[PDB]
Each structure stands twice: as structure tokens, then as C-alpha cells.
């Protein structure tokens with residue numbers, strides 16, 4: 085009965101009944117389910133016995149940055165507290181020893197190593213040999229002025245949390261084109277063999293329920309088929325009218341060559357090799373193609389031992405590795421010199437390998453099996469659809485194992501999208517993502533939401549559903565925590581639907597008061613309170629502050645939900661925006677890229693005071709956006725009295741930062757303005773105006789609502805006069821302040837160029853997302869031109885300077 089309860093809770097959580105998996109009677113699904121369940125159960129068993137500091141590393145991973153301070157410290161299970169004057173260079177152990185001395189003297193009774201410091205009212209902890217200023221929390225307090233509030237949590241109390249959370253044939257390749265086609269009856273199939281993007285041979289071609297009975301033969305023998313060969317079909321009508329497409333692997337998940345009848349449930353729309361290799365689930369309405377794979381003999385793909393035995397036998401390039409037909413022959417000829425003296429040029433060699441020649445593949449695989457590990461940057465390139473081979477993919481994952489949990493988190497969105505390129509359910513990328521999620525609860529949280537947010541997409545629902553199920557087997561406690569989040573989102577959807585309907589029939593004050601009555605119902609107060617934020621599991625959403633909740637006036641009536649927490653103090657006051665009706669994927673991608681820019685800038689000692697707030701799609705055109713409190717749009721501020729509208733922004737800054745605080749607010753504005761000008765320029769984010777640019781009371785400028793990127797609508801560099809007016813401290817002429825700002829823009833731009841390959845590799849992997857503004861090479865080209873990677877640093881700077889000077893004349 086406890087197993088029945090778990091199964092039904094997984095079905096509710098993942099948004100797909102587990103019985104739907106059994107009904108498909110698919111051995112590949114059944115084998116994934118059984119093998120991944122045991123793999124995830126072993127991880128849960130390993131975690132149950134972790135030491136209390138190891139459990140802390142799993143559950144509350146440290147949040148680190150890429151003088152003196154007062155710290156308030158209390159003990160768990162006590163209202164009494166003490167404020168200490170410690171240095172920002174002190175370790176958390178020095179703070180814990182200082183706190184324990186104050187408790188021993190106050191209790192009249194005479195071990196810091198048995199403790200960890202919790203950030204009050206947050207699932208965040210300060211531990212390890214790190215100075216206080218290297219923790220994101222202390223560093224954040226230092227900037228905002230605020231005093232850190234910490235709680236001494238004992239080892240026995242952390243161990244109580246761990247315990248509570250327990251559970252060949254030279255015959256040429258051929259097929260037989262042997263249902264519900266909807267096309268013009270006045271009019272009257274194209275097939276192709278692919279190994280990723282590359283064609284293995286020339287395309288071979290053929291008014292409802294059509295009968296062909298045609299022999300389709302390819303110019304390639306059955307022995308030359310690579311292990312990852314794809315047969316791609318396109319049903320169209322004779323300008324061209326496309327109807328449907330369908331792909332399939334020639335070998336199944338058990339390495340055996342497919343040799344029987346097949347019905348292909350087609351996806352509606354010429355050839356689409358990147359598209360999924362699984363049939364359309366809507367078998368009732370989709371067009372189908374009847375196909376027959378002839379019995380060529382069983383025949384399995386040769387095992388690694390047989391391949392290494394064949395590839396074992398065998399026998400100017402520096403200028404090529406920075407390609408023409410002759411240049412590809414000299415890369416292949418010196419393939420051993422490429423392995424021994426240019427291991428990082430592996431991808432270039434893989435691209436010139438004749439994948440339609442089995443002899444050439446075996447020799448490539450022979451070198452690959454002894455190739456040294458490559459840096460993470462090189463491994464991310466190998467994950468592209470251009471490299472579909474199973475051994476190349478396994479080598480890429482092996483090179484990605486050295487990723488830190490922080491780097492893994494930074495690239496997680498791309499690694500999830502790469503699952504859509506996978507040919508089989510059980511793959512080394514799924515195993516890697518699952519193992520890494522089960523060893524870090526933050527990774528497990530965002531992996532869950534990335535998969536859950538796409539369950540309404542038929543091409544990925546089975547795959548993503550199966551991975552979330554396996555994850556749930558590895559953490560019964562976390563499943564319950566994520567269920568509490570899903571229950572809140574379910575209520576926000578019902579509440580937002582009421583708001584949409586009510587706003588079309590009555591005034592704003594009236595709809596807002598009815599929203600509050602709906603929220604004040606017991607089922608709503610319960611579902612909306614006491615949860616971990618889906619935007620950030622370390623932020624606790626305690627009591628929903630109904631009186632402060634409202635909705636915004638745009639088409640979808642987004643909800644603005646406020647929360648508070650007595651235990652967290654002023655830092656427990658957090659807000660979330662719930663939006664339903666628009667897709668948040670591109671905003672999430674933009675914001676993660678800005679966050680990556682902020683990390684790269686900070687690694688070079690450049691802090692541009694950015695605000696990369698949370699954005700998380702959770703379902704079908706549904707998601708959450710983190711509220712940055714104490715901020716307002718440029719337009720709202722431009723609505724003390726300004727004699728000239730040009731002084732409004734500066735006057736607003738002055739009212740929030742009087743006396744000596746003004747100078748530091750102007751500086752925060754200048755730094756963040758340089759960062760956002762550079763980010764929007766490099767990413768090609770146009771349509772920036774007073775309604776989608778905001779300013780914080782600290783002076784920090786930030787952008788919101790990134791509806792367009794990569795020049796979709798070349799987006800020129802933008803210098804806005806009202807922003808230049810603040811940078812110049814309200815003066816007409818101030819080249820000393822203006823030119824410092826130009827230095828910030830140029831420094832930020834030159835740093836991004838040094839990591840240009842990282843942005844290109846991440847954006848190439850994101851082509852799997854199916855985002856309409858990141859759908860071809862022209863979109864990637866935009867980033868190559870904005871970062872000017874072909875030019876030297878001096879030419880790129882000169883060209884950036886021409887663009888910046890053009891923006892200043894336009895200002």
C-alpha cells in the first residue's frame with residue numbers, strides 16, 4: 085500500500101500516469117525503467133549513510149562568489165542572540181568558536197567543528213574553509229549595508245534531517261515502401277540516410293491511403309552502415325507542399341539490425357535528420373507510412389573488441405587547425421599526429437572521417453579509445469548533433485565528469501536540450517544527469533523543472549517522463565517537496581484564470597479584492613504557503629501576504645505574489661510573478677547568458693553589478709519570474725520635482741540615496757549600465773525602451789522581458805541620453821565620468837570575446853530547443869559577428885569603438 089501511494093504520487097508529480105508506460109508494451113521503455121530505478125536506488129542508499137557535512141554538501145550546496153562586519157548569531161532552539169564584530173577574512177569556524185564562547189559565558193557553564201551556520205529563514209548554510217566574504221550571502225550583505233543573521237545548527241540536528249528524509253554483407257542497403265494522408269487530390273515520398281547532419285549517400289525518392297510497393301535502394305552497402313545510422317522520410321505533394329516527416333534508427337537499442345515490418349506514425353510539417361526517432365503518439369489522426377526492412381541474413385553491430393582489432397592496423401596540418409577538399413585528406417592522413425600532438429583538434433578530425441565507410445570508422449574509433457581527456461569547452465562541442473556516434477558521445481561525457489557542480493548548474497539547460505538529439509532511451513547522458521542530480525539536490529531540483537516544463541510536448545513526454553520517474557525512485561523525500569511546489573502552481577493557474585475572467589468584467593480594485601478572497605480560502609492558504617521556491621530551492625516561501633498580492637495589466641494578467649517569514653527577517657520578504665499564456669524559455673536562456681557574462685566578468689575582477697533574476701518555465705506556457713524588490717521602471721520614474729524631464733532619474737536616485745550615498749548609487753548605475761549595454765549588444769536584444777528597463781534603489785539598472793534576441797524583430801549599440809545624463813552626474817560635459825564608462829563597456833566586451841567559443845558551443849546545443857529565434861546558422865552567425873572572433877583583439881576593439889561612437893552621436 086505504501087508502493088501504491090508512491091506510484092500515484094509520481095503520476096501526479098510528473099504529469100503522466102505510470103500505467104501509460106506499461107500499456108506501450110515496449111521492451112526499450114521496460115528496460116530503461118528497471119535499470120534506471122536500481123541505479124537511482126543505489127544512489128539513495130549511498131546518500132543515507134553520508135557524513136553530516138557530506139549530507140549538507142548534497143542538500144545545501146555552498147553558494148560562493150565566482151574589512152570588518154557585525155554578525156548576529158543565535159542558536160537553534162533559542163530566542164536569545166548575540167552580535168559580534170568579526171572580519172570579512174575570518175573563516176566560519178572562527179565565528180562558531182566566538183559564538184560558543186558567548187553562550188558558555190552567558191550560561192555560566194564551561195567544539196565548533198560539530199556545527200554549521202544556517203542563514204536565518206533560508207535553506208542556505210555557511211561551512212568549509214572559506215573566508216566570510218567569499219560566501220554569496222555575506223558578500224551580498226556587505227554591498228547592501230545589511231547585517232548577516234546566522235543560526236548555529238548542531239551535527240545531531242543535521243543528522244536528524246538526513247534520517248527524516250530516508251526512503252559483413254556487401255548487399256546494397258534497401259527498404260520496401262509498402263494511411264491517413266491529407267493533401268490536394270489534384271496533386272500526387274523522399275527518403276535519405278543520415279549520420280547526424282551528414283548524408284551517408286544521395287537522397288532516394290519514390291490521394292489518401294497510398295499504395296507504393298516500390299523497392300528503395302541506397303548507394304551504400306549494408307556493411308558500411310554506422311551504428312548510429314538514421315533513415316529519414318518526408319511525405320510531400322507535387323511549388324512544394326510539405327505534409328509529414330518520420331525518422332528511425334537502422335539498429336535498435338540492443339545493437340541488432342532492424343529486419344522486419346514497421347508502421348511509421350508521422351509528425352506533421354524537407355528531410356528532418358535532427359528530429360526525434362520515435363513515432364507520433366497521436367496514432368488516431370497522424371499520417372502513417374508502411375515500411376519493410378528485408379532480412380539481410382541475426383546481425384548485431386560488431387563489439388568493441390572486433391572494432392579495435394580492425395582499426396588497429398594502419399600507419400601543413402598546423403595551419404589547417406585554427407576546410408577545402410584537399411585539406412580534409414591531410415587531416416585524415418596525419419590522424420595519429422593529430423592524437424599525439426593536437427588532442428584538442430579531435431572534433432576537426434571527426435568531421436573529416438568518412439562515416440559511410442566502415443574501415444574508416446574502426447580506425448577513428450581505435451584512436452578515440454586511447455584519446456586523452458579534453459577540457460570541458462572541447463567536450464561541450466562534442467555534444468552537438470554533428471557528433472552522433474555512441475563512442476564519441478560516451479568520450480564527451482567522460483570529459484564532462486570533471487565539471488564542478490557550479491559549472492554543471494550553469495550548463496544544465498543545454499545538457500537537458502541535448503537529450504532531444506538522443507537516439508535511444510538508456511544513454512550515458514541520462515545516466516550522468518541522473519547521478520549528478522541524485523548527488524546534489526539543487527541540480528535535482530532544476531533537472532526536474534526543466535523536464536516537467538516540457539511534458540505537454542509529445543516528442544519528449546515519454547523520455548522526460550521516464551527520467552523524472554527514475555529520479556523520484558532515488559529521492560522519495562524530494563518528490564514530496566516538489567509535489568508541494570506543483571500544488572502551489574496548480575492553485576496559481578486556477579487563481580490566474582479567475583483574474584483573467586474577472587478583469588474583463590469589472591474594475592481593477594474589484595478584481596484584486598476578489599483575488600484576495602479566493603486566496604483567503606483554506607485550500608489556497610494551505611497550497612500557497614510553506615514551500616521551497618521553484619526559482620531557488622534555498623529561498624523558503626513561508627506566509628503568503630495576501631494584502632500585498634496583485635496582478636499586472638498586460639494581456640495575460642500576470643500575478644504578483646508576495647511572501648513573508650518572521651524567522652528570515654527582512655530577507656524573508658520575497659516576491660514571485662506567475663505568468664500563464666506566454667512562453668518563458670527564451671527569457672530563461674537570455675537571463676542565464678547574462679548570468680554567465682556576470683561570472684566571466686567577475687573571474688577577471690570586473691563586477692558590473694548585474695541583476696540576473698530567476699526565470700523558470702514550469703509547464704505549458706507557464707512559469708515563474710523572481711521579483712527584485714525596491715525597483716521601478718524608467719517610465720514610472722519619469723512620470724523631488726524636476727524642472728526638466730532629464731533630471732527625473734537623477735532626482736529619484738537622490739531621494740533614495742541622500743548625502744554621501746549618491747556617489748555610490750551613480751557608480752552602481754554606471755557599472756550595470758555598461759554591463760547591460762554590452763549584453764544587449766552582444767546578444768542582439770532590440771526593442772529596449774523605458775517600460776522594459778528598471779532601476780533598483782541602490783542605483784543598479786537592469787533589463788526585463790527579453791522578447792527578441794539575435795537581431796530578430798543587426799541591432800546597434802545603444803547609448804540612451806537619460807542614462808548618459810546620470811553617468812555624467814547631471815552635467816552637460818563630463819568626459820572624466822563618461823570615458824570611465826566607455827572603459828567599462830570595452831573591458832566587458834573584450835572579456836566576453838575571450839570566452840566566445842563557450843557562448844557559440846552553448847548556443848549550438850540550444851538549437852535543440854526549437855526556439856523560433858534560435859533555429860538556424862544565421863542566428864549563430866549573429867553571435868560570431870557581434871563577438872568578431874575572426875578578428876584580432878585590436879581590430880575587434882576598433883570596430884566596437886566605431887559602434888560605440890556611432891551610438892554616442894545617435895544619443
Ligand SMILES: Nc1cc(C(F)(F)F)c(-c2cc(N3CCOCC3)nc(N3CCOCC3)n2)cn1
Nearest residue numbers: 642661663671697709710711712717788789790
Ligand atoms: N517575459 C517577461 C514578462 C514579465 C511580466 F511579468 F510582465 F509578465 C516580466 C516582468 C515584468 C515586470 N513588470 C513590472 C513593471 O511593469 C511592467 C511589468 N516586472 C518584472 N520584474 C521581474 C524582476 O524584478 C522586478 C519585477 N518582470 C519579465 N519578463
